Amino acid sequence: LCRFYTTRSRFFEAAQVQTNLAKSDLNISLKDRIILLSRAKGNASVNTIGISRQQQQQLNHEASELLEIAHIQDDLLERLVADPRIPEERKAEIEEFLDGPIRTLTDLFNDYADQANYYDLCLLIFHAADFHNPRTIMDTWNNLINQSHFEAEQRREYWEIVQAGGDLPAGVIAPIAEPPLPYVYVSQQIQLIAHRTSLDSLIFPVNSLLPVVCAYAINNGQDASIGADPCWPIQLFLNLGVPHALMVQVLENVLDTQEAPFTGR
Amino acid sequence: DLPPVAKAAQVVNQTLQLDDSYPDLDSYCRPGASSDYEMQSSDSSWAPFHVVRHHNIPDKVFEHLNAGEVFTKLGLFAEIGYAWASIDSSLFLWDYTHPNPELIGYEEATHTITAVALVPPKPGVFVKTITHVLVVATTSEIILLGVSATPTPSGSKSLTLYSTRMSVHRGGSDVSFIVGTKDGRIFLGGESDTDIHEIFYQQEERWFSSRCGKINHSHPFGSRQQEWLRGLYVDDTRNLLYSLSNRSTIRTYHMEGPEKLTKVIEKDKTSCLRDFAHMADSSPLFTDKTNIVALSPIPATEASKLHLMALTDTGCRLFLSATSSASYTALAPQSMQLQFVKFPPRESPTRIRTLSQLDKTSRALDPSALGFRFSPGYFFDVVRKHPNQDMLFVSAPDTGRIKVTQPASALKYFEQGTWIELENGNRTIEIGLTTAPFAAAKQPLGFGNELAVQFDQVPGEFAVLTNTGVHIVRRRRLVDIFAKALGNCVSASDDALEREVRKFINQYGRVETIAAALAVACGQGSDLMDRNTENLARAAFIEYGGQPRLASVRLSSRHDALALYLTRLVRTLWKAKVVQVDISSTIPTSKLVTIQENVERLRNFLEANKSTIQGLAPPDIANQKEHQALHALQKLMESISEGISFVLMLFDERVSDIYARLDAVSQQQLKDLTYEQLFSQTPGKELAKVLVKAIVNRNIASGANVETVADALRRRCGSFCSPDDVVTFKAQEQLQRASEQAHNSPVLRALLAESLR
Amino acid sequence: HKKLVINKDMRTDLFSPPN
Amino acid sequence: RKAKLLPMEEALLP
């Protein structure tokens, strides 16, 4: 039906059919619901004669929001199923409730993303929900940084054992190449999220996030001692596209208040 | 001699006793056997259960599950709406009612997880906000975690985890089964042997004792043959613990103390088979080749003699009694005997609708892989005839037929059954109750009366966990079936309704059927076309309600239906004390509101049909007493609503303050005041008139507003308040407020002069 | 659902086998 | 996300 409509330049009618189908309780897989929404989004973004711009935009917007949530749900499901630390018994249960109609952001957060400590996805969820809560957002940033640091540390350790002759714990895939220093893997995590949310989000309050990253750098010796650029935190946020004025503005505040580790010498 | 409300209260008291005389399980599962079923298609309006929704497993859990190196496992926490999945040494919980849940991950464990359970906490150990304990068993240790499952605005518990430093090394025995008692005792068993262990834990650390310990209650020694456990089962009402072995041996343990566990019965399959052979009806469905796949304890509240149900792989439900050697020293039983067998139904599931001896040979439930029983007898059986698709047989007691059966010697285990199909690939793992445990009474007689509690507790719902998701199955009440059936009669003849109604009368009797019509007419079942269904229900209540007749008179079935419905709306109130002395209310305020709304909607229904319903309008001796009886019930209804409004008014104030400034006789009268007395006995009315006369006195001391509390008492609880008392209250208002303003000179001469007026 | 509801009160232990 | 495990101090009284 949709194919018929489109060839007749009736894109809006196709977007309507596809969207409703994606919201329906028919037996449709999550990935198919992602395709349906993605098509509707495209079809509603172009003019269809006889239909008001307002009506087009409202549909294009509903498809865009549902598509964002759908992608989150798909990222979850995939990660959970592949997670070595999740019991098989549970995985089958997760696949049943996530590989179907699109769920609310509350559920995705509480029942899955928060339970499995997938903090990066938690952040994407706070973005999609326009979640106004600076403290929780920062708590999640702090957990993500620390989790990533510990994982990078672990991987560098395993490597050091290979290069010394030792044996890795049973069922640990060796690293045939020097993995990245912790500050490199952490900043990788920050970039992946930034590109996904576009810095204009409330999960990038530079006034809170930049001091925390700088704090991390100091309190974990991610500096010259290990061969890192001592300004790496600043480089990171500049390339990311934070305006220069705002940077200096925050750094000033850091210097005046002399908080947490930014003290003495 | 006897006024209306007192006459109607007599009908209520006798109706309460009639509902509480519903046969106990022992009475219709007497020694012998049964194959009584009425099967219903799952898509039929008469289906006893039906699927209401499904919840897929989150995709992230599928990612972890398919990332499993050695071992995975799924399970249910149906009490709080959570499921869990273990992958090797990692555990993930999530709220399955949430549309996009976040995964609560716990990966501290070092070795493979083999069992997980959610149990109550030991009292006086943890902060009150800790609602549960999470037990995590690995191949190396058992770990206790504190849990707080506080409800959220959405209706799904918020789960947060607490560390405890409580753990013990496992030992050599596998742990695959964990169960908890009401008091927080934790018992363990597994697939290494038949031993039962218990985990102890305490708040204080001692130099001679750790915070957490483990002991083997079985004390094994010497020669031991291979045998291990298939499950553990608790019955708190009897302080018993049951184990089922791989050889189908049933062991019973008694908790003679807070730290003791004593084996008191051991009954192997041979003993069960010997009992079975002594029964009148032996069957090839139960032999030495047959396996017992599941047990289900039966609590003492439900039945005195029958302690346990055992399910065979052929689908036979074995009901076992247990008895103590003596009557005094909890008392531990010492014998267990197979007494009664419910054999499988014969009808198999079909895509197309297909068209009196004991049936003891049916293979319809062969093979039964998993089985569950919930009070008052809801039975779920996972039949695995094919290795890819499970079929779910679900049955309930035929409460309507059991209640009407007469005499008692004709009682049999009648059941309503249905087949629920799960899609290809769905392997059922576990089934758990999501709502509060069912109980219509506090003792076996009356316990199983589903009809009595249709409007006091939501229908039972059950979470069916599969490898693909969680399916919600809901028990359907008579009013649900009646409303659905009538919904199909909307487009049919006058005789189409009469035909459907006659089905209900032949099963439930006329009174129960007309009571269901009255309930549907009043909007019951609508929490689930609806105007036409309610109008059809009204038409059924009028047309088929019968009439009064000389035998002393026999009132119509329409009257008994109104009395039955009204009684069941207030059964939780009638005999209960109004207050609990720091005085508080016995019944939560939210419950009093819903009861009042139900009573008022019933009253509204009678008023809107005063002209069309026989007996309401005034009318020879038969119709006379019919009019008097119906009038008395309606006077009790308004009295019930006034009484409830009075109790709500009372606790909106500061009752403890009012209770303090009160005489002893009136404190004692209020101490043992029941709702029945408040509704239907002069002393409740006289005491009510005292309390109102006292609350206003106090209200004036607070002095927020007199004329608002006035109009509050004036209208709603009129006929119990007096207009000469509010004007008096208005006078005592200015008098006390003249004593409040006493220091002022010119303000009193207006207060005292108006008080005098 | 694109609306979040946190509820730590009553969850299901992610790190345990099921009852 | 690894679940935050609040301390024993809050958990058990007194």
mmCIF file of C-alpha atoms in Angstrom, chain B residues 28-319:
data_model
loop_
_atom_site.group_PDB
_atom_site.id
_atom_site.type_symbol
_atom_site.label_atom_id
_atom_site.label_comp_id
_atom_site.label_asym_id
_atom_site.label_seq_id
_atom_site.Cartn_x
_atom_site.Cartn_y
_atom_site.Cartn_z
ATOM 1 C CA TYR B 28 -15.679 -31.781 47.944
ATOM 2 C CA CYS B 29 -12.329 -33.588 47.628
ATOM 3 C CA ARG B 30 -13.331 -36.511 49.833
ATOM 4 C CA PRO B 31 -11.458 -39.829 49.551
ATOM 5 C CA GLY B 32 -11.995 -41.079 46.013
ATOM 6 C CA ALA B 33 -11.469 -39.512 42.588
ATOM 7 C CA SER B 34 -13.011 -37.117 40.086
ATOM 8 C CA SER B 35 -12.820 -36.196 36.401
ATOM 9 C CA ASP B 36 -15.460 -33.437 36.411
ATOM 10 C CA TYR B 37 -14.715 -30.660 33.911
ATOM 11 C CA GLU B 38 -16.593 -28.177 31.786
ATOM 12 C CA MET B 39 -14.126 -27.041 29.120
ATOM 13 C CA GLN B 40 -14.371 -23.603 27.513
ATOM 14 C CA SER B 41 -12.746 -22.286 24.363
ATOM 15 C CA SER B 42 -10.134 -19.650 25.165
ATOM 16 C CA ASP B 43 -11.921 -17.108 22.943
ATOM 17 C CA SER B 44 -15.281 -17.771 24.628
ATOM 18 C CA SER B 45 -16.980 -15.322 26.972
ATOM 19 C CA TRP B 46 -17.164 -18.228 29.455
ATOM 20 C CA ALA B 47 -13.385 -18.698 29.534
ATOM 21 C CA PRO B 48 -12.260 -18.907 33.197
ATOM 22 C CA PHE B 49 -8.942 -17.181 32.392
ATOM 23 C CA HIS B 50 -7.564 -15.109 29.541
ATOM 24 C CA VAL B 51 -4.382 -13.334 28.474
ATOM 25 C CA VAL B 52 -4.598 -9.561 28.978
ATOM 26 C CA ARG B 53 -1.141 -8.419 27.827
ATOM 27 C CA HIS B 54 2.460 -9.490 27.204
ATOM 28 C CA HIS B 55 5.882 -7.983 27.956
ATOM 29 C CA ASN B 56 8.870 -8.835 25.767
ATOM 30 C CA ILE B 57 12.283 -9.470 27.292
ATOM 31 C CA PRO B 58 14.454 -6.341 26.818
ATOM 32 C CA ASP B 59 16.842 -6.525 23.873
ATOM 33 C CA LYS B 60 19.824 -5.837 26.144
ATOM 34 C CA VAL B 61 19.026 -9.050 28.033
ATOM 35 C CA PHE B 62 19.038 -10.930 24.719
ATOM 36 C CA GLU B 63 22.473 -9.443 24.001
ATOM 37 C CA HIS B 64 23.787 -10.705 27.344
ATOM 38 C CA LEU B 65 22.002 -14.063 27.048
ATOM 39 C CA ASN B 66 23.462 -14.823 23.617
ATOM 40 C CA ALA B 67 26.794 -13.612 25.042
ATOM 41 C CA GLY B 68 26.627 -16.480 27.546
ATOM 42 C CA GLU B 69 29.756 -18.619 27.714
ATOM 43 C CA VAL B 70 28.571 -21.532 29.885
ATOM 44 C CA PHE B 71 25.318 -20.965 31.767
ATOM 45 C CA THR B 72 22.209 -18.761 31.772
ATOM 46 C CA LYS B 73 18.941 -18.728 33.712
ATOM 47 C CA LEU B 74 15.674 -16.762 33.915
ATOM 48 C CA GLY B 75 13.267 -16.267 36.813
ATOM 49 C CA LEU B 76 10.343 -14.282 38.182
ATOM 50 C CA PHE B 77 9.738 -11.934 41.108
ATOM 51 C CA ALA B 78 5.991 -11.767 40.470
ATOM 52 C CA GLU B 79 5.255 -10.274 43.911
ATOM 53 C CA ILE B 80 6.858 -6.966 42.843
ATOM 54 C CA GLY B 81 6.509 -7.154 39.059
ATOM 55 C CA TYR B 82 10.191 -7.884 38.377
ATOM 56 C CA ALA B 83 12.003 -10.527 36.344
ATOM 57 C CA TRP B 84 15.681 -11.455 36.382
ATOM 58 C CA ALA B 85 18.291 -13.076 34.168
ATOM 59 C CA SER B 86 21.651 -14.515 35.224
ATOM 60 C CA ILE B 87 24.538 -14.859 32.757
ATOM 61 C CA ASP B 88 27.508 -16.761 34.199
ATOM 62 C CA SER B 89 28.591 -14.627 37.188
ATOM 63 C CA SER B 90 26.367 -11.628 36.319
ATOM 64 C CA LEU B 91 22.772 -10.853 37.322
ATOM 65 C CA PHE B 92 20.270 -8.440 35.759
ATOM 66 C CA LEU B 93 16.873 -7.409 37.166
ATOM 67 C CA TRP B 94 14.183 -5.351 35.457
ATOM 68 C CA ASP B 95 10.577 -4.230 35.903
ATOM 69 C CA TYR B 96 8.631 -6.110 33.226
ATOM 70 C CA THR B 97 5.547 -3.884 33.574
ATOM 71 C CA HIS B 98 7.608 -0.899 32.366
ATOM 72 C CA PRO B 99 7.529 -0.404 28.566
ATOM 73 C CA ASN B 100 11.262 0.455 28.277
ATOM 74 C CA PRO B 101 12.880 -0.813 31.491
ATOM 75 C CA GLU B 102 16.395 -0.045 32.660
ATOM 76 C CA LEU B 103 18.465 -3.064 33.694
ATOM 77 C CA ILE B 104 19.552 -3.238 37.344
ATOM 78 C CA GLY B 105 22.945 -4.924 36.965
ATOM 79 C CA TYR B 106 24.811 -6.741 39.738
ATOM 80 C CA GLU B 107 28.163 -8.264 38.763
ATOM 81 C CA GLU B 108 30.129 -8.450 42.030
ATOM 82 C CA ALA B 109 29.872 -12.249 42.024
ATOM 83 C CA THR B 110 33.014 -14.151 41.062
ATOM 84 C CA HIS B 111 31.534 -17.559 40.137
ATOM 85 C CA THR B 112 28.558 -18.863 38.174
ATOM 86 C CA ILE B 113 25.147 -18.011 39.631
ATOM 87 C CA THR B 114 23.042 -21.139 40.181
ATOM 88 C CA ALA B 115 19.981 -19.764 42.010
ATOM 89 C CA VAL B 116 18.342 -16.438 42.869
ATOM 90 C CA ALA B 117 15.369 -15.674 45.115
ATOM 91 C CA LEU B 118 13.543 -12.781 46.780
ATOM 92 C CA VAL B 119 12.517 -13.486 50.381
ATOM 93 C CA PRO B 120 11.175 -11.508 53.354
ATOM 94 C CA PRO B 121 13.713 -10.033 55.789
ATOM 95 C CA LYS B 122 14.368 -11.216 59.314
ATOM 96 C CA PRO B 123 12.511 -8.809 61.653
ATOM 97 C CA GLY B 124 14.507 -6.454 63.836
ATOM 98 C CA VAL B 125 17.574 -6.810 61.590
ATOM 99 C CA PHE B 126 17.243 -4.190 58.845
ATOM 100 C CA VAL B 127 15.859 -0.686 58.555
ATOM 101 C CA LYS B 128 12.089 -0.720 58.062
ATOM 102 C CA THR B 129 12.471 0.585 54.497
ATOM 103 C CA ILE B 130 14.130 -2.714 53.493
ATOM 104 C CA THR B 131 11.199 -4.746 52.163
ATOM 105 C CA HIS B 132 12.968 -7.903 50.935
ATOM 106 C CA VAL B 133 16.251 -9.807 50.913
ATOM 107 C CA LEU B 134 17.831 -10.899 47.632
ATOM 108 C CA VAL B 135 19.588 -14.277 47.929
ATOM 109 C CA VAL B 136 22.178 -14.974 45.212
ATOM 110 C CA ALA B 137 23.710 -18.467 45.174
ATOM 111 C CA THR B 138 26.847 -19.259 43.160
ATOM 112 C CA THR B 139 29.037 -22.346 42.863
ATOM 113 C CA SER B 140 31.268 -20.831 45.586
ATOM 114 C CA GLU B 141 29.043 -18.887 48.006
ATOM 115 C CA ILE B 142 25.605 -17.511 48.859
ATOM 116 C CA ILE B 143 25.220 -13.724 48.997
ATOM 117 C CA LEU B 144 22.532 -11.682 50.765
ATOM 118 C CA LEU B 145 21.547 -8.234 49.483
ATOM 119 C CA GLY B 146 19.110 -5.808 51.036
ATOM 120 C CA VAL B 147 16.218 -4.737 48.821
ATOM 121 C CA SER B 148 13.804 -1.800 48.977
ATOM 122 C CA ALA B 149 10.840 -2.248 46.606
ATOM 123 C CA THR B 150 8.884 0.960 47.218
ATOM 124 C CA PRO B 151 5.884 1.612 44.931
ATOM 125 C CA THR B 152 6.015 4.410 42.363
ATOM 126 C CA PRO B 153 3.352 6.725 40.890
ATOM 127 C CA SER B 154 3.168 4.477 37.808
ATOM 128 C CA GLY B 155 2.249 1.369 39.806
ATOM 129 C CA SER B 156 5.545 -0.549 39.570
ATOM 130 C CA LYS B 157 7.939 -0.958 42.481
ATOM 131 C CA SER B 158 11.177 1.046 42.502
ATOM 132 C CA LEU B 159 14.018 -1.350 43.330
ATOM 133 C CA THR B 160 17.271 -0.304 45.024
ATOM 134 C CA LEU B 161 19.932 -2.677 46.352
ATOM 135 C CA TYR B 162 21.940 -2.536 49.587
ATOM 136 C CA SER B 163 25.135 -4.335 50.522
ATOM 137 C CA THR B 164 25.175 -6.305 53.775
ATOM 138 C CA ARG B 165 28.619 -7.930 54.295
ATOM 139 C CA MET B 166 26.534 -11.098 54.833
ATOM 140 C CA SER B 167 27.792 -14.147 52.937
ATOM 141 C CA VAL B 168 28.895 -17.738 53.511
ATOM 142 C CA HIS B 169 30.912 -20.257 51.539
ATOM 143 C CA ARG B 170 28.604 -22.705 49.789
ATOM 144 C CA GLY B 171 30.424 -25.981 50.303
ATOM 145 C CA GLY B 172 30.146 -29.149 48.273
ATOM 146 C CA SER B 173 26.369 -29.182 47.736
ATOM 147 C CA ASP B 174 24.835 -27.424 44.734
ATOM 148 C CA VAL B 175 22.194 -24.753 45.405
ATOM 149 C CA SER B 176 19.387 -24.645 42.822
ATOM 150 C CA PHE B 177 16.378 -23.929 45.078
ATOM 151 C CA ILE B 178 15.929 -21.113 47.604
ATOM 152 C CA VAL B 179 12.745 -20.489 49.601
ATOM 153 C CA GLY B 180 11.894 -18.045 52.358
ATOM 154 C CA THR B 181 9.426 -18.081 55.222
ATOM 155 C CA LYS B 182 7.184 -15.289 56.475
ATOM 156 C CA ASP B 183 9.705 -14.660 59.281
ATOM 157 C CA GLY B 184 12.722 -14.397 56.958
ATOM 158 C CA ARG B 185 14.154 -17.898 57.365
ATOM 159 C CA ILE B 186 16.146 -18.952 54.281
ATOM 160 C CA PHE B 187 16.309 -22.621 53.223
ATOM 161 C CA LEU B 188 18.507 -24.099 50.472
ATOM 162 C CA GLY B 189 18.623 -27.276 48.383
ATOM 163 C CA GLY B 190 19.975 -28.460 45.074
ATOM 164 C CA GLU B 191 20.952 -31.166 42.618
ATOM 165 C CA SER B 192 23.846 -32.746 44.569
ATOM 166 C CA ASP B 193 21.835 -34.508 47.291
ATOM 167 C CA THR B 194 18.611 -34.249 49.297
ATOM 168 C CA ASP B 195 20.125 -32.248 52.173
ATOM 169 C CA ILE B 196 18.424 -29.035 53.284
ATOM 170 C CA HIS B 197 20.533 -26.143 54.563
ATOM 171 C CA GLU B 198 19.514 -22.948 56.340
ATOM 172 C CA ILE B 199 21.237 -19.556 56.295
ATOM 173 C CA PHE B 200 21.272 -17.598 59.553
ATOM 174 C CA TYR B 201 22.135 -13.925 59.812
ATOM 175 C CA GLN B 202 22.100 -11.262 62.511
ATOM 176 C CA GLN B 203 22.857 -7.565 62.837
ATOM 177 C CA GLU B 204 25.600 -7.703 65.478
ATOM 178 C CA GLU B 205 29.148 -8.909 64.887
ATOM 179 C CA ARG B 206 30.574 -11.089 67.661
ATOM 180 C CA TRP B 207 34.046 -12.396 68.429
ATOM 181 C CA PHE B 208 32.680 -15.958 68.707
ATOM 182 C CA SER B 209 30.160 -15.817 65.843
ATOM 183 C CA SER B 210 29.968 -14.233 62.398
ATOM 184 C CA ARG B 211 27.128 -12.091 61.068
ATOM 185 C CA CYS B 212 26.088 -14.881 58.669
ATOM 186 C CA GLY B 213 26.154 -18.653 59.069
ATOM 187 C CA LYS B 214 25.037 -21.840 57.351
ATOM 188 C CA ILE B 215 24.112 -25.276 58.711
ATOM 189 C CA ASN B 216 23.020 -28.617 57.269
ATOM 190 C CA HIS B 217 19.748 -29.707 58.894
ATOM 191 C CA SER B 218 19.894 -33.233 57.421
ATOM 192 C CA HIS B 219 22.953 -34.488 59.360
ATOM 193 C CA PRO B 220 23.804 -37.179 56.777
ATOM 194 C CA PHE B 221 26.257 -40.018 57.298
ATOM 195 C CA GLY B 222 27.144 -43.544 56.243
ATOM 196 C CA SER B 223 25.941 -45.123 53.015
ATOM 197 C CA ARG B 224 23.883 -42.864 50.741
ATOM 198 C CA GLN B 225 22.493 -43.632 47.287
ATOM 199 C CA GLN B 226 22.145 -41.092 44.485
ATOM 200 C CA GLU B 227 19.137 -38.786 44.913
ATOM 201 C CA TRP B 228 18.666 -35.013 44.653
ATOM 202 C CA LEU B 229 15.920 -32.388 44.780
ATOM 203 C CA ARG B 230 13.497 -31.038 42.186
ATOM 204 C CA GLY B 231 12.021 -28.296 44.391
ATOM 205 C CA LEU B 232 11.419 -26.828 47.840
ATOM 206 C CA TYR B 233 8.039 -25.617 49.124
ATOM 207 C CA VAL B 234 7.015 -23.667 52.254
ATOM 208 C CA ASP B 235 3.724 -23.563 54.171
ATOM 209 C CA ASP B 236 3.908 -20.897 56.888
ATOM 210 C CA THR B 237 0.389 -21.640 58.163
ATOM 211 C CA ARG B 238 1.619 -25.065 59.339
ATOM 212 C CA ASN B 239 5.328 -24.239 59.884
ATOM 213 C CA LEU B 240 6.143 -26.954 57.339
ATOM 214 C CA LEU B 241 8.732 -27.317 54.588
ATOM 215 C CA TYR B 242 8.410 -29.858 51.755
ATOM 216 C CA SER B 243 11.034 -31.228 49.370
ATOM 217 C CA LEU B 244 10.497 -33.192 46.155
ATOM 218 C CA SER B 245 13.266 -35.500 44.944
ATOM 219 C CA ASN B 246 14.195 -36.805 41.502
ATOM 220 C CA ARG B 247 12.853 -40.212 42.592
ATOM 221 C CA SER B 248 9.477 -38.563 43.376
ATOM 222 C CA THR B 249 10.033 -38.926 47.139
ATOM 223 C CA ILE B 250 8.145 -36.363 49.245
ATOM 224 C CA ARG B 251 9.812 -35.298 52.500
ATOM 225 C CA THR B 252 8.062 -33.168 55.138
ATOM 226 C CA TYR B 253 9.997 -31.055 57.652
ATOM 227 C CA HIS B 254 8.563 -29.215 60.669
ATOM 228 C CA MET B 255 9.940 -25.974 62.123
ATOM 229 C CA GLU B 256 9.595 -26.809 65.811
ATOM 230 C CA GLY B 257 11.503 -23.619 66.638
ATOM 231 C CA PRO B 258 12.959 -20.420 65.181
ATOM 232 C CA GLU B 259 16.228 -22.262 64.440
ATOM 233 C CA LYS B 260 15.168 -25.941 64.299
ATOM 234 C CA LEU B 261 14.086 -28.094 61.358
ATOM 235 C CA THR B 262 13.034 -31.716 61.919
ATOM 236 C CA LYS B 263 12.189 -34.301 59.278
ATOM 237 C CA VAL B 264 8.844 -35.811 60.273
ATOM 238 C CA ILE B 265 7.577 -37.657 57.155
ATOM 239 C CA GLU B 266 9.276 -39.427 54.248
ATOM 240 C CA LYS B 267 6.930 -40.885 51.615
ATOM 241 C CA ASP B 268 8.401 -42.476 48.491
ATOM 242 C CA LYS B 269 6.615 -43.139 45.209
ATOM 243 C CA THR B 270 6.004 -46.748 46.278
ATOM 244 C CA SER B 271 3.984 -45.536 49.270
ATOM 245 C CA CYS B 272 1.937 -43.216 47.054
ATOM 246 C CA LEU B 273 1.365 -46.112 44.646
ATOM 247 C CA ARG B 274 0.268 -48.400 47.489
ATOM 248 C CA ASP B 275 -2.289 -45.830 48.668
ATOM 249 C CA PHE B 276 -3.431 -45.474 45.057
ATOM 250 C CA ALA B 277 -3.906 -49.240 44.726
ATOM 251 C CA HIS B 278 -6.141 -49.291 47.821
ATOM 252 C CA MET B 279 -8.435 -46.732 46.168
ATOM 253 C CA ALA B 280 -11.515 -47.894 44.286
ATOM 254 C CA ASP B 281 -10.259 -46.537 40.936
ATOM 255 C CA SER B 282 -6.748 -47.493 39.830
ATOM 256 C CA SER B 283 -5.384 -46.156 36.565
ATOM 257 C CA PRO B 284 -2.524 -46.701 34.096
ATOM 258 C CA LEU B 285 -1.821 -42.956 34.373
ATOM 259 C CA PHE B 286 -0.009 -43.584 37.692
ATOM 260 C CA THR B 287 2.532 -46.432 37.871
ATOM 261 C CA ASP B 288 6.085 -47.063 39.059
ATOM 262 C CA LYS B 289 7.227 -45.496 35.763
ATOM 263 C CA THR B 290 5.383 -42.239 36.516
ATOM 264 C CA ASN B 291 7.270 -39.189 37.814
ATOM 265 C CA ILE B 292 6.018 -36.496 40.193
ATOM 266 C CA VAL B 293 7.124 -33.206 38.627
ATOM 267 C CA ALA B 294 5.846 -30.596 41.105
ATOM 268 C CA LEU B 295 4.346 -30.023 44.540
ATOM 269 C CA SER B 296 2.056 -27.272 45.794
ATOM 270 C CA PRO B 297 1.347 -26.751 49.519
ATOM 271 C CA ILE B 298 -2.254 -26.253 50.624
ATOM 272 C CA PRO B 299 -2.471 -23.893 53.634
ATOM 273 C CA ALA B 300 -4.389 -24.657 56.812
ATOM 274 C CA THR B 301 -6.655 -21.674 56.115
ATOM 275 C CA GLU B 302 -7.897 -23.496 52.998
ATOM 276 C CA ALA B 303 -8.164 -27.077 54.276
ATOM 277 C CA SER B 304 -7.539 -28.934 57.531
ATOM 278 C CA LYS B 305 -6.691 -32.426 56.248
ATOM 279 C CA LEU B 306 -5.400 -31.985 52.676
ATOM 280 C CA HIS B 307 -1.868 -30.598 53.049
ATOM 281 C CA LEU B 308 -0.342 -30.991 49.604
ATOM 282 C CA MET B 309 -0.994 -31.372 45.885
ATOM 283 C CA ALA B 310 1.390 -33.450 43.766
ATOM 284 C CA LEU B 311 1.374 -33.363 39.960
ATOM 285 C CA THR B 312 2.415 -36.382 37.894
ATOM 286 C CA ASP B 313 3.943 -36.182 34.431
ATOM 287 C CA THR B 314 0.710 -37.791 33.159
ATOM 288 C CA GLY B 315 -1.317 -34.833 34.458
ATOM 289 C CA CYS B 316 -2.843 -36.410 37.572
ATOM 290 C CA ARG B 317 -3.272 -34.147 40.598
ATOM 291 C CA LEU B 318 -2.618 -36.178 43.762
ATOM 292 C CA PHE B 319 -4.083 -34.616 46.917
#
